[PDB]
Amino acid sequence: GSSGSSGQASGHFSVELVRGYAGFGLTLGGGRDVAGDTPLAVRGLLKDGPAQRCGRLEVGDLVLHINGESTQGLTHAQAVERIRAGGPQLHLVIRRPLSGPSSG
């Protein structure tokens, strides 16, 4: 197709990890479910896992896309799939929300 061109203040970042052992040890909470519509966001981090170690992913992070694919139509089960099928390398688009730092 075409290489394309990206911006600088993209805002969103990608996540690169290496299959540690039988998965990445990353869990997601919420997402688009028939019992409710919620924005996909990391839930639990497999202790001593590739996700927690990296520190790039934390509980609460919001997911906008995955493996360069639009999740606007991918459910909690559809998203995970793309991840596993992604291959030996994981790629997820996470964009931290806009919040203020706690002060005393």
Task: Give one DSSP letter per residue of 31-58, joined into a string.
Answer: -EETTEE---EEEEE-TT-HHHHH-S--
Round to whole Å and give the CA distance between 41 and 31: 7
Backbone φ/ψ region at 60: left (φ over 0), alpha (ψ -120 to 50), beta: left
Q: Hey, what are 47's tokens?
A: 């202790």
> Whole domain around residue 48: which residue ranges?
1-104
CATH of the domain at 80: 2.30.42.10
Give me the count of residues in the chain.
104
The count of structural domains within the chain is 1
Distances (CA, A) of 76 to 4, 36, 43: 29, 11, 12
C-beta contacts of 17-23 below 8 A and 24+ residues apart: 17/50, 17/51, 17/54, 17/89, 17/90, 18/50, 18/88, 18/89, 18/90, 19/50, 19/88, 19/90, 20/49, 20/50
How far the first Cα of the chain sits from its last, in Å, is: 53
Q: How was this structure determined?
A: NMR
